[PDB]
Amino acid sequence: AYLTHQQKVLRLYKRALRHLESWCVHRDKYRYFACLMRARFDEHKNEKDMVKATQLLRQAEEEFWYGQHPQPYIFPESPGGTSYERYECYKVPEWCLDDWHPSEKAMYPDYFAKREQWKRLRRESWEREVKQLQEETPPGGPRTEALPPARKEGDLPPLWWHIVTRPRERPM
Amino acid sequence: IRLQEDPDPEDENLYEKNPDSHGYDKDPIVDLWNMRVVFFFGFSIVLVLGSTFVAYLPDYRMQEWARREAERLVKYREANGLPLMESNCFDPNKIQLPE
Amino acid sequence: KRLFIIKPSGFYDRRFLKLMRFYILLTGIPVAIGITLVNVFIGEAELADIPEGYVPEHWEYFKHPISRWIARTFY
Amino acid sequence: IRWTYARSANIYPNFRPTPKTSLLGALFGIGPLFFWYYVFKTDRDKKEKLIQEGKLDQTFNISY
Amino acid sequence: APPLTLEAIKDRVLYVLKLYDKIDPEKLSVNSHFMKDLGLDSLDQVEIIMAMEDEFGFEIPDIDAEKLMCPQEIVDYIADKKDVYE
Amino acid sequence: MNVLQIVRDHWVHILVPVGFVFGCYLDRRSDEKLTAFRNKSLLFKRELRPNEEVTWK
Amino acid sequence: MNPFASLTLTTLIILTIPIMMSNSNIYKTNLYPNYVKTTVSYAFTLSLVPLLMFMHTGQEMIISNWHWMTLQTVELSLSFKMDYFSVMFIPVALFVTWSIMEFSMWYMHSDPFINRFFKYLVLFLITMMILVTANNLFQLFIGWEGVGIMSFLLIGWWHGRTDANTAALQAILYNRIGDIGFVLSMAWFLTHSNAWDLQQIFMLNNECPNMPLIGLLLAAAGKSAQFGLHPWLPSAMEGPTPVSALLHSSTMVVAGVFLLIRFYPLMETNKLVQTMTLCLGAITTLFTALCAITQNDIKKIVAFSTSSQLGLMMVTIGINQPHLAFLHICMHAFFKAMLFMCSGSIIHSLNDEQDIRKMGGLYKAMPFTTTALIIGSLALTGMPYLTGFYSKDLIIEAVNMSYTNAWALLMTLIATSLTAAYSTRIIFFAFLGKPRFPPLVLINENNPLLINSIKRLLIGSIFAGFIISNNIPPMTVPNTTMPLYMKMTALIVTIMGFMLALELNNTTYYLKFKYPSQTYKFSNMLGYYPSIMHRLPTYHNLSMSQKSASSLLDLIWLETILPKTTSFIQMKMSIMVSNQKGLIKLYFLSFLITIMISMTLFNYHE
Amino acid sequence: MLKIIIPTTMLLPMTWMSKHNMIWINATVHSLLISLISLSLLNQLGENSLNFSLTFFSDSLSAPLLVLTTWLLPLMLMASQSHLSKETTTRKKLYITMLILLQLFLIMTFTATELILFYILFEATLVPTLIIITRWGNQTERLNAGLYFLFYTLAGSLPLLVALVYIQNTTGSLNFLIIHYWSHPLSNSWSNIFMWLACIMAFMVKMPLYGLHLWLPKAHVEAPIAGSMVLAAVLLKLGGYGMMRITTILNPLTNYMAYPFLMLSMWGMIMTSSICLRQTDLKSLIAYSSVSHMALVIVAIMIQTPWSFMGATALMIAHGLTSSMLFCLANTNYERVHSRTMILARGLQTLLPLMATWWLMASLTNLALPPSINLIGELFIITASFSWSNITIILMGMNMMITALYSLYMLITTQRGKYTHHINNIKASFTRENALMALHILPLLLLTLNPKMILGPLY
Amino acid sequence: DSWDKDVYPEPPRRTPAPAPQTSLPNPVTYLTKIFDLLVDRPVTLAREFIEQQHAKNRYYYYHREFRRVPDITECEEKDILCMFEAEMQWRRDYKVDQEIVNIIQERLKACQQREGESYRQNCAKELEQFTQVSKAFQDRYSDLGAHYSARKCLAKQKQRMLAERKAAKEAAA
Ligand SMILES: CCCCCCCCCCCCCCCCCC(=O)O[C@@H](COC(=O)CCCCCCCCCCCCCCC)COP(=O)(O)OC[C@H](O)CO
């Protein structure tokens, strides 16, 4: 939505230090230069001229865009990292398990029985949670992708199934 | 409603009726028989013995007879010392080339 | 601990793969036995010179017995 | 489905013959074809010119 | 790797805030909302979540980085992102 | 054994086989008209056997 | 007709059994990795006997087995040629992959498709030992893509990783560029020399193989990842570690170099072609090493070190040194394979982290892994009397001691100094430092699978060249009278490169900070090649396919010239014909005209 | 001869008089049996073609295609009994009647001894295919597609009719043996060029070359599964068979007139394969790939070199079997997703593990990966073309380069990658689909052991 | 031996007698030794069993021989009855000549491994024999077209002595 200025500098602060970490590498240097980088950040904290803050921002990332490490440091699980969706090929959607042959389903009776319960809740909760959504939908369509919780008791929050039943990040 | 029509029918799952469905038709017993027909007269009759048929087909293109004529021809040819195989094929002595 | 792993049903694939190993081998081993058996029973013909006063049979001009039999029965 | 339509069918009905399309079609049409014709023609015009006069070697070339 | 559980996360979590010298140990609570009671500047909040990032080895997106605010809520977002349920 | 019905629903299985049986018949009938140069090409022409009269049927 | 010929062929038939057993699906779905490892182990032990028969006698076989099919004057037949090159590559390749197989179990102790993984390795392994052993060019061509496609699947082992498919697609594409050269040499040899068996080609003494050798050269460059066709190998790190430790380290990538070694007798007769062989090897040595010393991923460092080695290999084949090149293949097989599993050791144990900036202090944490890496690093640099010395020190002396391109000769020396440079970078950042990994330490190497695998390869690297050099017959001309100033160059440059690299590396310990030098901005980005040459040509050809080609011609013009124009012409004049007025007056007037023209004007009467 | 024809036509009453639900069974039983009998026909003698009568004869070229067509016949029945199950019995019987009547015409055409007899059922094959494409086709543009396919070949076939009868009135009979033995050097008189053009363009249209290939994408995409395979696995080869028979009386005019077709073909394959690299429809991508492979045959046949002919037949069988498999691949995932866009159903390997394998080996065969017959076909053509001219390898090899990219492009886009979340109807693959797939791929590898069977008369 | 030595001339093998001086045991000898009583002998025992079974019921087969027939240079114009024997006989000789080139090619390829590093000069006889055959083969069937027929082969040949005799007239001067 409104990417306000304070979020921008925090994003500037976070990624610049991450790049700065990729440069000093050694912890003592990283700690040292972060503190001075910290100091030169908060020293100019008193500007009633928000435009001047933007102007001070305009040359900031340009130096960063020169100061950026050509190979920054990313934890492998993150996008660009070595272990990005490495285990995606293993995770399979839960609905596919309904296809399983009865002999295969018989191999896991109680878990499949517990699946039946989950199928039961999602059935009546769907009507309940869709009814809650319609009765509280803002006029002229949704304004933000944010989703309301379950206002009353007992009912589940709307559109909960896929997030709750999402395959685990480490499926093997 | 434009025309009095029918909604698009839902694709029936052959598995949900009979989990041992073989995707050949609806009725189970013939489905199991369709299994037997396609695999028997497919893999078994045609693929196995058919492969042996073509593999063990008699001399095709005279590939080995041509060989057997070759060594007897070449052994004769260098026995006399004359060139191994003539550059000419239709003996020019009987050719009656114009002028 | 040990927790349920989700996986697409392999039963239909497993049954199907078992079917080739049944139906292909159904004629596989008897044929493999037969091809070997004729190679341990009557062997391979040798290149014999054409005897006088007798032109051979049409199928006789082959060394492998199966090829001769195929020529005898079909061509 | 809009993307597939716009990239499969909704081209010719929206196509209009213009010098930009006309020249581009000719440039990427007859252009490369005649270019390759010229290249292979001269190459096939240099090859036989060698062998009628015996200026090329195929002493071991039999399986042509 | 042994299954890291929520008790392990919080033990590792408040360990680092106790480490952080501006967060002195005595007033550490699992629900210690940073600037309301610790007085911790929000410009250092973007600095502690990357401290969490190296602590557990992964990236916290910026969308919830500024939302990741309470030490209990620090653990709360850690658990589901690694399906830590035990 | 339901024979009155098993033939009704399985008499189609015999048409194609007899078609192949029929197919060889015309195959072995048309060739007779094509006799002509039977044992007449000098490449294959040779003395007849004492009992056999037709070299290739 | 000794057991040599019979049992050197049965070696191949041994490794085929795990594939056939797997397809039965009765195969042990639990201990399959143990099954295949022991199978490769026996194939290795069998592979010794042809070797011990070789250095004693020196006989090399040609096994023209079952005749596939005969083409008039061509007799394409499955034929195996047990040359000295093949009789020794078989044991070392088996020995390396057997070591990899033991390491693979420990590394992939959690992969659900582990049995499929091991099956792929054998199929690759099968495809290679029919590549090295290939009496005819066709079965040599069989492996040349059998290994390539096996690389594609193995690289894309993690199917979901979008980049892995991109790297997998990249590998086959760059390989396919080389196959254009391969098939070009194929066509020439069949058209001119009327064969594909290596015997007839050599006997027909094609001493002017300008187009063939160029075709062979292009085939090698794609397979061995030379300049212009290198970046697929550095991008092939997205595959799993044992995959890269076997294929893209010392076994698959070296196939391109092995091609010219097969065709060395025709290679030396020409003078022009070997010039750009050592030219291509020279430029490859820098650019791979130049980008090597600036990367921050161990997999990136090691692979660039490999491509620098294969850059050096073709320098040897440049100036008439095929046998020493094959020697370098054997040595490169030992220590280079070790470095990857050593790096794989620290990767998996330290929570699958591959950024060289996060290790440090691992010397005491992993005494064996650190011990293994430093021996491998010294072997790669060419420490005397240990592995690389028997090949690299001979090569650097050899290329210096010959009539070569002056620039090409200088090129190898900078590479050798740069070879030590990144070697120090690995030992410095990874081991000689302070811990930088996440606080929870799970450092571990005590698993016997890792210990046995590394030690098995380690003791091989220790002696290595001493056994091979002393055992193989002296089959190259040994240069003797070297001026001492250049005979030390093999040791001077690497020791020199050690000093500056060490000084530059611990300059990071110095508190001073410097903004990126433009040279670093160039070297660290893979030498600026992937950023442009993988984005500019790909966009144009793709944009040509959609904008022009399909849309412009296939869906607009080709449907307008012939079909639509005729349809438009027919419709436009069909309407005017059918558009009649229905008044007899107009129709009868037409008859009067029709009578008039027919009678007189059209001369129908006369 | 008649041992294959009568059983084929006698199969027609069987389907019409079979039980209500046994039609698929009994047809499949004997369609496989016919292939077995046709497999016996595959034997060939040394040099004389296997001649049966004035009406029918077979050589080393017709027999591999004959066994291919009869072998195909069960496969459409196998591949069609999924979208026709909910149809009235008469329409199912009428559908089955179309294929076997079509399959009858192919057997007659390849075995024909007289060019006119070859010509009559050369056109007769279209009538059943036009019915199949239009009636049972599942789309809207099938109507225009049927018109495009029908009119294109007719526009080329009718000039052949005038050409063929001209040979009859000038050189007596058009029997293949008599025309081959009494061949005369065709002059370069400006009429003989138009004589040459008429005798060639008919096969050119139903052998899609660049420019005259726009009927193929609309025909292949819009036709049902059975129609797509038959039109791509045997029908395109009808043009190929025509040339090997008909260029007997087109030399040395073929030496000079080949250039415009060679230039259109060699450049066309690069263009068409480029289209494959950016196709949105999976069936269209497979269709355009057929253009590239067929365009490769165009160069092969028009060169008129022993090696070129041998590779021409090799690619002829290999491409047909492979394209039939790929159309099965596209058909097998289509009804699951009910759309043809490639990117709609990604990551199918995770959901369907065996289809990943089947689609994998389908890609390798289309890749001309050695030693698949596709490689033998392509590699043979490369050497023949290279001897013709050295430059063509640049065009020739670049096609193999582009062929690698698009062939794997479908694999990565569909099989590999992240599964699309919204779809939930993908059921475990029916064993019929799996069996049909192995029915295709397995004989291809079986043929690898005996290339001599499919090399052709030049062998 | 099954094949003929004249067709496949094999120069006698010069195998040196083993004469080692080093005292430590020569391993390779042992590997051949333990191979002999583990693989070679059991193979031989099975082989002598199959051979005696084969000779128990021995069935024969001969080699088909085609007698000479009038070829195309004396076959009357048109008259395809005579053309058939002419064409078939010529095509039979084509396959024989193709096999003749094959026999030479194997002999040439056999020298390569047989002569080892001496291949360049030891079997120059093999090289010239193939050169003589390949050149003669070119004058016989090369560039005949994919639709080659005995008429074309006669046609191509008839040009050869046409140019040759024309050259002979020029040479005579
Ligand atoms: C959709 C358009 C056509 C598509 C492409 C088809 C192929 C292009 C060429 C089409 C030629 C069609 C007519 C060919 C019939 C057989 C030709 C033949 O056998 O050769 C004769 C060639 O003779 C001709 O004149 C043939 C026709 C030449 C072209 C003129 C008509 C065809 C073009 C217009 C009609 C088709 C175009 C579509 C119109 C709507 C030999 O006779 P001759 O002239 O040598 O006779 C002896 C003496 O010299 C005098 O007779």
The DSSP secondary structure of G552-586, one letter per residue, reads IIIIIIHHIIIIIHHHHHHHHHHHHHH-----HHH
- DSSP, collapsed to helix, strand or coil, labels residue H118 as helix
Taking the C-alpha atoms of residue G561 and residue G572, their distance in angstroms, rounded to an integer, is 16
| Listed residue (H9, F20, H67) closest to H58, CA to CA | H67
Other Cβ atoms within 10 Å of H143 Cβ, number? 13
Query: How long a stretch of residues is chain E?
Result: 86
Under a CB-based contact definition with an 8 Å cutoff, are residues G44 and G98 in contact? yes
Tell me which DSSP letter residue H452 carries: G
Could you write out the DSSP letters of every residue in E20-49? STTS-GGG--TT--IIIII---HHHHHHHH
Q: Residue holding tokens 């429809």?
A: H281
Using the beta-carbon criterion (under 8 Å), do I158 and B66 form an inter-chain contact? no
Taking the C-alpha atoms of residue I40 and residue G2, their distance in angstroms, rounded to an integer, is 10
Bridge partner list, I60: C46
Per-residue tokens: A36: 């001075």
Q: Which conformational region is residue G227 in: left (phi greater than 0), alpha (psi within -120 to 50 degrees), or beta? A: beta
Q: What share of chain C is helix, strand, coil (3-state, %, to 5)?
A: 55, 5, 40
Q: What share of chain G is helix, strand, coil (3-state, %, to 5)?
A: 75, 0, 25
Taking the C-alpha atoms of residue H41 and residue B53, their distance in angstroms, rounded to an integer, is 11
Residue type, position A116, single letter: E
* Burial class of residue G263 (count of CB atoms within 10 Å of its CB; 0-12, 13-18, 19+): buried
Per-residue tokens: H403: 């062929």
Q: Which of C12, C31, C68, C69 to mutate to test the interface with H (most CBs of H within 10 A)?
A: C12
| Listed residue (H443, H440, H307, H437) closest to H376, CA to CA | H307
Other Cβ atoms within 10 Å of G149 Cβ, number? 22
Please choose from H157, H194, H206 the residue to mutate so as to test ligand 1's pocket, defined by most ligand atoms within 8 A of CB.
H194
Question: To which H or E segment does residue E16 belong?
Answer: helix E6-19
Taking the C-alpha atoms of residue G277 and residue G217, their distance in angstroms, rounded to an integer, is 7
Who's near F48: CB < 8 A, 6+ residues apart?
F39, F55
Q: Which experimental approach was used here?
A: cryo-EM
Q: Residue holding tokens 């061949």?
A: H183
Chain CA centroid to CA H270, Å: 20
- DSSP, collapsed to helix, strand or coil, labels residue H112 as strand
Q: Residue holding tokens 């263009």?
A: H271
Under a CB-based contact definition with an 8 Å cutoff, are residues H224 and G564 in contact? no
Looking at the annotation, which residues of E are catalytic? 41
Which of A26, A66, A88 is closest, CB to CB, to G509? A26
The alpha carbon torsion through H248, H253, H254, H256 (nearest 10 deg) reads: 170
Tell me which DSSP letter residue H281 carries: B
Per-residue tokens: G469: 């050099």
- For helices H115-124 and H142-171, angle between their N-to-C axes, nearest 10 degrees: 170
Query: How long a stretch of residues is chain B?
Result: 99
- What are phi and psi for residue G443, nearest 5 degrees? -65, 130
| Listed residue (G203, B84, B87) closest to I6, CA to CA | B84
| Listed residue (H26, E43, G334, I88) closest to B34, CA to CA | H26
Who's near G283: CB < 8 A, 6+ residues apart?
G227, G311, G411
Q: What angle do CA H396, H397, H399 make, to 5 degrees?
A: 75
Taking the C-alpha atoms of residue H440 and residue H76, their distance in angstroms, rounded to an integer, is 11
Taking the C-alpha atoms of residue A155 and residue A160, their distance in angstroms, rounded to an integer, is 11
Who's near C67: CB < 8 A, 6+ residues apart?
B56, B57, B58, B59
Under a CB-based contact definition with an 8 Å cutoff, are residues H339 and C1 in contact? no
| Listed residue (G278, G315, G485, G309) closest to G382, CA to CA | G309
Query: How long a stretch of residues is chain D?
Result: 64
Buried residues in C1-37 as b, exposed as e (16+ CB within 10 A) = eeeeeebbbbbbbeebbebbeebbebbbeebeeeeee
Bridge partner list, C46: I60
Per-residue tokens: B85: 């195989």
Taking the C-alpha atoms of residue G359 and residue A25, their distance in angstroms, rounded to an integer, is 10
In total, the C-beta contacts within 8 angstroms joining chain G to chain H are 117
Radius of gyration of chain C (CA): 24
Under a CB-based contact definition with an 8 Å cutoff, are residues I96 and I71 in contact? no
Per-residue tokens: G527: 């030498």
Is H169 close to ligand 1, i.e. is its CB under 6 Å away? no
Query: How long a stretch of residues is chain I?
Result: 173
Under a CB-based contact definition with an 8 Å cutoff, are residues H37 and C74 in contact? no
Inter-residue long-range contacts of B11-16, CB under 8 Å, 24+ positions, other chains counted: B11/H335, B11/H338, B11/H425, B13/H427, B14/H430, B15/A99, B15/H427, B15/H428
Chain G CB contacts of E55 under 8 Å are 438-439
Under a CB-based contact definition with an 8 Å cutoff, are residues H14 and H22 in contact? no
Chain A CB contacts of E47 under 8 Å are 13-14, 17, 38
Question: To which H or E segment does residue I61 belong?
Answer: strand I60-61
Under a CB-based contact definition with an 8 Å cutoff, are residues G203 and I108 in contact? yes
Inter-residue long-range contacts of G108-116, CB under 8 Å, 24+ positions, other chains counted: G108/G240, G108/G242, G110/A172, G112/A90, G112/A172, G112/C5, G114/G32, G114/G33, G115/G22, G115/G27, G115/G29, G115/G32, G115/G33
Taking the C-alpha atoms of residue B57 and residue C68, their distance in angstroms, rounded to an integer, is 9
Using CA of residue G544, residue G548, residue G553, residue G554, what is the dihedral sign? positive
Per-residue tokens: H89: 């019995």
Question: To which H or E segment does residue G80 belong?
Answer: strand G79-82
- DSSP, collapsed to helix, strand or coil, labels residue H326 as helix
Taking the C-alpha atoms of residue G469 and residue G481, their distance in angstroms, rounded to an integer, is 20
For residue H450, give Cα distances in angstroms to C31, E14, G95, H372: 19, 73, 36, 11
* Burial class of residue H362 (count of CB atoms within 10 Å of its CB; 0-12, 13-18, 19+): buried
Q: What angle do CA B29, B30, B34 make, to 5 degrees?
A: 125
For residue H156, give Cα distances in angstroms to H203, H208, H298: 8, 12, 16
Who's near I171: CB < 8 A, 6+ residues apart?
none
In terms of DSSP bridges, do strands C46-47 and I60-61 run parallel, antiparallel, or are they unpaired? parallel
Neighbours of chain I (3+ CB pairs under 8 A): B, C, D, F, G, H
Nearest chain C Cα distance for residue A168, angstroms: 10
Nearest chain D Cα distance for residue I143, angstroms: 7
Chain F CB contacts of H5 under 8 Å are 23
| Listed residue (G250, G231, C24, G76) closest to H370, CA to CA | G76
| Listed residue (B83, G190, G200, G193) closest to I129, CA to CA | B83
Using the beta-carbon criterion (under 8 Å), do G557 and D61 form an inter-chain contact? no
Is H193 close to ligand 1, i.e. is its CB under 6 Å away? no
Who's near H374: CB < 8 A, 6+ residues apart?
H293, H314, H315, H318, H319, H322, H365, H366, H367, H368
Who's near G57: CB < 8 A, 6+ residues apart?
I28
Omega before B83 within 30 of 0, i.e. cis: no
Taking the C-alpha atoms of residue G236 and residue G144, their distance in angstroms, rounded to an integer, is 18
Task: Kindly state the greatest CA–CA separation across chain F.
Answer: 62
Could you write out the DSSP letters of every residue in chain A? ----HHHHHHHHHHHHHHHHHHHH-SHHHHHHHHHHHHHHHHTS---S-HHHHHHHHHHHHHHHHHHS-SS----TTSTTSTTSSTTTTT---GGGGGGS-HHHHHTSHHHHHHHHHHHHHHHHHHHHHHHHHHHHPPTTS-SSS------SSSSPPTT-HHHHTPPPS---
- What are phi and psi for residue G136, nearest 5 degrees? -115, 155
The answer to whether residue H48 neighbours chain C at the CB level (below 8 Å) is no
Under a CB-based contact definition with an 8 Å cutoff, are residues G398 and G334 in contact? no
User: Which residue, judged by its Cα, is nearest atom 42 of ligand 1?
Assistant: H191
Who's near B16: CB < 8 A, 6+ residues apart?
none
Other Cβ atoms within 10 Å of G343 Cβ, number? 25
Q: Where are the beta strands (DSSP E) in B1-99?
A: none
- What are phi and psi for residue G99, nearest 5 degrees? -60, -40
Taking the C-alpha atoms of residue I128 and residue I107, their distance in angstroms, rounded to an integer, is 12
Per-residue tokens: G341: 């599993």
The answer to whether residue F27 neighbours chain H at the CB level (below 8 Å) is yes
- DSSP, collapsed to helix, strand or coil, labels residue H414 as helix
Instruction: Find the distance separating the first CA and the last CA of chain I, reported in whole Å.
Output: 57
Question: To which H or E segment does residue F50 belong?
Answer: none
Taking the C-alpha atoms of residue G121 and residue G129, their distance in angstroms, rounded to an integer, is 12
Task: Kindly state the greatest CA–CA separation across chain C.
Answer: 88
Please choose from H191, H204, H253 the residue to mutate so as to test ligand 1's pocket, defined by most ligand atoms within 8 A of CB.
H191
Could you write out the DSSP letters of every residue in E47-64? HHHHHHHHHHTSPPPHHH
Taking the C-alpha atoms of residue I133 and residue I98, their distance in angstroms, rounded to an integer, is 11
Taking the C-alpha atoms of residue H405 and residue G177, their distance in angstroms, rounded to an integer, is 11
Chain F CB contacts of I89 under 8 Å are 43
Residue type, position B59, single letter: D
- DSSP, collapsed to helix, strand or coil, labels residue H138 as coil
Q: Residue holding tokens 């021409």?
A: H312
| Listed residue (A72, A56, A87) closest to A14, CA to CA | A72
Resolution (A): 3.6
SS3 of H362-377: HHHHHCCCCCCHHHHH
Who's near C15: CB < 8 A, 6+ residues apart?
H431
| Listed residue (H208, H300, H196) closest to H251, CA to CA | H196
- What are phi and psi for residue H114, nearest 5 degrees? -110, 135
Bridge partner list, G61: G82
| Listed residue (G543, G385, G376, G534) closest to G461, CA to CA | G376
Q: Which conformational region is residue G265 in: left (phi greater than 0), alpha (psi within -120 to 50 degrees), or beta? A: alpha
Taking the C-alpha atoms of residue I56 and residue G306, their distance in angstroms, rounded to an integer, is 63
Is H161 close to ligand 1, i.e. is its CB under 6 Å away? no
Buried residues in H175-190 as b, exposed as e (16+ CB within 10 A) = bbbebbbbbeebeeee
Under a CB-based contact definition with an 8 Å cutoff, are residues H397 and G180 in contact? yes
| Listed residue (G373, G357, G382) closest to G464, CA to CA | G382
Per-residue tokens: G103: 């390491």
For residue H396, give Cα distances in angstroms to G179, G288, H272, H273, H308: 12, 32, 13, 12, 13
Tell me which DSSP letter residue G528 carries: G
Taking the C-alpha atoms of residue G16 and residue G39, their distance in angstroms, rounded to an integer, is 10
Is H164 close to ligand 1, i.e. is its CB under 6 Å away? no
Per-residue tokens: H275: 């289209």
| Listed residue (H366, H99, H378, H121) closest to H238, CA to CA | H121
Under a CB-based contact definition with an 8 Å cutoff, are residues G301 and G423 in contact? no
Instruction: Find the distance separating the first CA and the last CA of chain G, reported in whole Å.
Output: 97
Question: To which H or E segment does residue G546 belong?
Answer: none
Taking the C-alpha atoms of residue G255 and residue G223, their distance in angstroms, rounded to an integer, is 7
Bridge partner list, G63: G80
Taking the C-alpha atoms of residue G584 and residue G586, their distance in angstroms, rounded to an integer, is 6
For residue I88, give Cα distances in angstroms to H161, H392, H458, I70, I72: 32, 36, 14, 10, 10
